[PDB]
Amino acid sequence: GSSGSSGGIKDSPVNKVEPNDTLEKVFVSVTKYPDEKRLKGLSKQLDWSVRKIQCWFRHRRNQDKPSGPSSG
């Protein structure tokens, strides 16, 4: 015989990584992997640091992807 598998509805992230959501947009608005040039602005916008922000971006993808068992 034989068999298969199917899906569809999946879980969703409740808690937000950070209030820097403003990035979530640019990530898929201008580029998923921006450069300092961009960080220069956000740095002030979200009173964050070019470095601190970067981390947020890298994490973004993780959350997006289907991989992420991290449960608060």
Name all domains of the chain by residue range, CATH numbers in brackets. Answer: 14-67 (1.10.10.60)
Cα atoms in the Cβ-side hemisphere of radius 13 Å centred on 18: 16
Cβ atoms of 25 and 64 closer than 8 Å: no
Measured between alpha carbons, how far is residue 72 from residues 14, 20, 54 in Å?
A: 10, 18, 21
SS (H, E, C) 45-71: HCCCCHHHHHHHHHHHHHHHCCCCCCC
Dihedral angle, C-alpha 63, 59, 24, 40, nearest 10 °: 180
Distance CA 52, CA 57 (A): 9
Q: Which two tokens stand for residue 19?
A: 């209030």
Distance CA 8, CA 30 (A): 29
Cβ atoms of 53 and 23 closer than 8 Å: yes
Method of determination used here: NMR
